Write a protein that binds this ligand. Structure first.
Ligand SMILES: NC(=O)c1ccc[n+]([C@@H]2O[C@H](COP(=O)([O-])OP(=O)(O)OC[C@H]3O[C@@H](n4cnc5c(N)ncnc54)[C@H](OP(=O)(O)O)[C@@H]3O)[C@@H](O)[C@H]2O)c1
Ligand SMILES: NC(=O)c1ccc[n+]([C@@H]2O[C@H](COP(=O)([O-])OP(=O)(O)OC[C@H]3O[C@@H](n4cnc5c(N)ncnc54)[C@H](OP(=O)(O)O)[C@@H]3O)[C@@H](O)[C@H]2O)c1
Ligand SMILES: [Cl-]
Lengths: 252, 253
């Protein structure tokens, strides 16, 4: 139902994490198609260069990319990325925290403790540290938009989703704290729950699922566009479902 | 909450309490012993733990055992070693109260110390998970085990300046729900308790201008703690309960 003009994001500088594949890749491509100056973040250089070349072929402007491994980045290793961005851009109008680690799908009694900690580190701790590093740039926007990525399991825990579900609950908590802090300020903060979407992470979570029964990243982009454009400027502290009527769990 | 069980409610129940050296955990340990339980005290401060054990020994004439485990510094191995020590002395665990928690510092996200943030997540989420995992076999030996996590009002709705702590309490609720779902067809029930504003040092740290005399004490909120460990709550799982349902979240006015 949301069909914005093709220049919705013209002149908006938007950073996308996990831009090298799946939903983040589609978000980067789509934001560029809608006029934005996109900044790509990921850990795999070759995958990032590929997405950037795809965007340059269509927009005739090469977007910049930065590699940052959220699992191993120390507190200072995130601020360094913000300094590099600040050297080339005067502000950030949007930040989409899309990067995420699934970890292990299995019972709590078997959850590998190191993997548990890695999931919490990428999805929660490093996501927080990166956010802290980028807030100054976000506050230079006339109406900045900060978006975190949750999941169906971020609102209702489900058996065998261990660290990932716990990390998505944490994500919603973090978003709500930030939304309240910036309530009457220039920055809005919200979460997007994409719902079951056709990506390799989803296929790993549900190996018996038929991915053709799922919506594609392209299909769920309207919400992604809406949160970065001016139509959502009065909305903060909310978790929005990209697929409100989708039955949670494996596709039937 | 007018729950007033018989004084023998927890007779022949082995219950482990973390953060048993002060505040709510200390009160829970004393109260469970008074209601008949064989209490196991966990904390990081040996001297504090010994004092609480002695206090229970003075009244029950049966001194409960204590184990030291620092949740901020423990490894998965150290949790298994404690569960192994417990299994050596006890045949099961009928209850586990995860009461231990770290507040961190009240302040905006832009100012949050990343090391303190990590410390809060480590104690409240990661170490709480590791200990849970280590204790599941003992809990499953109970006829009706009860696993209880401790949340907060900010674990249901995030508010400004609560940073790592609010985030960790959301995580706590999530972890509890995963566990409840996994054990719903087994003998173990899993729930959360939100004690509400209670007169403790952590509460004073969270609200430095609050008059603590306007708060209920840990003793005053015990009915829910007893209820969750006794047979009257055996068909309840996956829920988050408020010890003070008639209190508006926030500073005491
Ligand atoms: N697809 C779904 O059904 C679904 C449902 C609900 C929520 N989500 C959420 O949607 C987001 C995107 O996931 P997706 O399905 O698109 O999965 P995906 O294709 O695996 O993409 C995940 C992205 O996160 C990046 N990433 C993982 N670990 C990283 C690290 N340590 N440092 C930096 N980047 C890292 C990945 O980089 P690499 O390319 O190097 O792997 C990748 O770009 C996640 O937050 C996920 O939890 C997805
Ligand atoms: N008081 C409230 O108004 C309130 C409200 C909502 C939720 N809660 C929750 O209630 C629980 C109890 O809090 P409280 O108010 O009783 O706080 P408290 O008086 O500070 O007690 C905290 C307990 O946790 C233990 N602890 C802290 N860090 C530890 C560590 N690294 N390793 C092992 N144990 C550690 C403490 O040990 P030490 O004795 O060595 O310091 C202490 O026994 C917490 O989970 C808290 O989040 C409290
Ligand atoms: Cl021993």
């Amino acid at each position: 139902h949301y069909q914005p003009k093709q220049d919705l994001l013209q002149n908006r500088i938007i950073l996308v994490t996990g831009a090298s594949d799946g939903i983040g890749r589609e978000a980067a491509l789509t934001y560029a198609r809608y006029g934005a100056t996109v900044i790509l973040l990921g850990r795999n250089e070759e995958k990032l260069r590929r997405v950037a070349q795809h965007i340059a072929d269509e927009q005739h402007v090469q977007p910049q990319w930065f590699t940052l491994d959220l699992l191993t980045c120390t507190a200072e290793e995130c601020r360094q990325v913000a300094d590099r961005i600040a050297a080339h851009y005067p502000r950030l109008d949007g930040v989409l925290h899309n990067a995420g680690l699934l970890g292990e799908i299995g019972p709590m009694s078997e959850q590998d403790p190191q993997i548990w900690q890695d999931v919490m580190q990428v999805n929660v701790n490093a996501t927080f540290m990166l956010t802290q590093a980028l807030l100054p740039l976000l506050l230079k926007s006339d109406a900045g938009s900060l978006v975190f990525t949750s999941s169906s399991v971020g609102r209702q825990g489900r058996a065998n989703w261990g660290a990932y579900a716990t990390s998505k609950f944490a994500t919603e908590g973090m978003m709500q704290v930030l939304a309240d802090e910036y309530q009457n300020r220039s920055l809005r903060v919200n979460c997007i729950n994409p719902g079951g979407t056709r990506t390799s992470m989803r296929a790993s979570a549900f190996p018996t699922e038929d991915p053709q029964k799922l919506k594609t990243p392209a299909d769920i982009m309207p919400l992604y566009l809406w949160l970065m454009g001016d139509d959502s400027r009065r909305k903060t502290g909310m978790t929005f479902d990209a697929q409100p009527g989708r039955k949670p769990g494996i596709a039937q």
